[PDB]
Design a protein around this ligand. Structure first.
Ligand SMILES: Cc1cc2nc3c(=O)[nH]c(=O)nc-3n(C[C@H](O)[C@H](O)[C@H](O)COP(=O)(O)O)c2cc1C
Ligand SMILES: Cc1cc2nc3c(=O)[nH]c(=O)nc-3n(C[C@H](O)[C@H](O)[C@H](O)COP(=O)(O)O)c2cc1C
Lengths: 309, 313
């Protein structure tokens, strides 16, 4: 009849839904909750080789702002991949975001045998937007290329990159031109949060998060049109790669638009932070309802088929 | 005993509010309606040396939380807005800004040369648009710092008066610092408007499975509530890094509280785009009353008492 299945990266995902990196994925107990949910997959917290002040998160009327910075260290998440994750349940992604090309490369050499033995999939975070002193790596195309070449030399398996939003076609073209030179980059996740927004509270006349003078990354309804644009822009310019959509998903109708724009998988951040892992039962049901009303039987029938006018 | 007055640029503004460039300001009838409204000021549509019809329609679309547009600088031509500044605008009612958006530094400098005598006699104030995010082929000038420096040097040579610049949003501190370092080298840049729309978003209709505006494959500039936290961040980022310039806030203003936050972040004037497109010029009566109500509840008597005073917890 109808299916939400996604056959990519040598895996059959039950549906396109997973958590966004950093949400519900830092403790063993959250990973278990994610693994136990009806999501098609899950991803770990972006980790650093070794293990920001609070409040570092804040629920907004239209979404969220965050200045998280915090992880249990690479060894923990590599261990969770090694012999703690139930792969018969769903595939697993691990997010890494070392502070240099060398840290990332070192971490990948370590991951290589786990990935080969267990099937865990690397997502390299080039876009993280609260790193004090270090702007988004992918906003500096010379640094982008150096990271991607370093990882490609150190890592034998395919991997993905999590990208910041871009806001004009020259940057979309330049980024896609670089990514298209690295065959091991098999997927691109669009988008990380929109960086360095600022939220102020009317009553207290104060910023709502402590680090970085209140500047933090935006998620949720604020970022949805930007996320769709980036998904579609890279879908069009990187036809040899998969696009994962991330940003602004609250309903199956939101997920439908991400897929229409080009998304293979659909990550859920702010809405999952608010709803918990039961959201995935609602999203799959809502996605299927939209498809039923349109007569679609599989995602491959409309992925990327947004009609221009 | 409370006041919304703003004393900047040699004028007294009755209040901080004005239209955002491009909204309700393209024809004489719209400019007259802005002048008759209670806004403290107004600004013309960004103009080119010649008249332009702009991008094919539909090119504007109302979103749940704001708007998307790819207008493409439809405008009556510089000569029209110059004549409005010189001969029709009632300066006893309120000050006037003229926005210009030539396609090259030389286009902009020729327009400024003709504007200069009108600015000297009548007092119209120039806003240079470096951020227009829908001109097919031409990317946001202020996203290329070499072009930005070139445009500013060209206008500084051509134009004798202080002027302002309308800026695209930035999203990291390296870019905030690069832009502010350039701006601080041009003494004639006296105000900075943050922000123009967030460029090249994309909206798709679920029912039709197609983009909602025609140009550029449906990609267009976002306005309205989507952009509010980004707009506040840009206002405060430049407020901090350009202490010798005024900051004008633009983006996401639908209420007097939204305007209060802009001023708290450092805005001297507050521009209103999407919300004004939807409500019309009566919005300014509501915004002033709402802003006065926020200040009454806090004991503020003037905007100088809290402008820029956001507390970093
Ligand atoms: C609290 C929080 C923590 C996050 N941590 C990470 C992270 O560690 N690595 C990463 O690549 N993205 C991180 N993100 C960004 C999300 O993965 C996602 O890109 C963003 O929130 C937009 O999705 P949304 O609109 O569904 O929230 C984080 C987001 C939030 C709100
Ligand atoms: C229909 C429309 C036309 C616009 N035209 C211009 C323009 O000609 N020049 C300019 O600098 N900005 C233009 N803008 C951008 C607005 O001035 C403003 O920066 C943006 O809409 C964000 O403000 P808002 O959230 O209040 O809408 C236009 C915006 C819209 C929606």
């Amino acid at each position: 009849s109808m299916s939400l299945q996604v056959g990519i990266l040598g895996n059959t995902f039950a549906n396109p839904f997973m958590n966004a990196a950093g949400v519900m994925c830092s403790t063993e107990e959250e990973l278990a909750a994610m693994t136990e949910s009806t999501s098609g997959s899950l991803i770990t917290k972006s980790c650093t080789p070794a293990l920001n002040p609070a409040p570092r998160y804040y629920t907004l009327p239209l979404g969220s702002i965050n200045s998280m910075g915090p992880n249990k260290g690479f060894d923990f998440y590599l261990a969770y991949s090694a012999r703690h994750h139930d792969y018969s349940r769903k595939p697993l992604f691990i997010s890494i975001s070392g502070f240099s090309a060398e840290e990332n490369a070192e971490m990948c050499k370590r991951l290589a045998p786990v990935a080969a033995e267990k099937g865990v999939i690397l997502e390299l975070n080039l876009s993280c937007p609260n790193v004090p002193g270090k702007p988004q790596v992918a906003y500096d195309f010379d640094a982008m290329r150096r990271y991607l070449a370093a990882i490609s030399e150190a890592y034998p398996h395919p991997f993905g990159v999590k990208m910041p939003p871009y806001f004009d076609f020259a940057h979309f073209d330049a980024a896609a031109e670089i990514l298209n030179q690295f065959p091991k980059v098999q997927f691109i996740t669009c988008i990380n949060s929109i960086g360095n927004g600022l939220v102020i509270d009317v009553e207290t006349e104060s910023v709502v998060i402590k680090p970085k003078q209140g500047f933090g990354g935006l998620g949720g309804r604020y970022v949805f049109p930007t996320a769709l644009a980036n998904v579609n822009a890279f879908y069009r310019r990187c036809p040899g790669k998969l696009i994962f959509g991330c940003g602004g998903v609250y309903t199956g109708e939101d997920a439908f638009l991400h897929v229409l724009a080009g998304a293979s998988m659909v990550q859920v951040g702010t809405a999952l932070h608010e709803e918990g892992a039961a959201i995935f039962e609602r999203l799959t049901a809502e996605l299927l309802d939209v498809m039923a009303k349109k007569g679609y039987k599989a995602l491959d029938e409309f992925r990327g088929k947004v009609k221009a006018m």
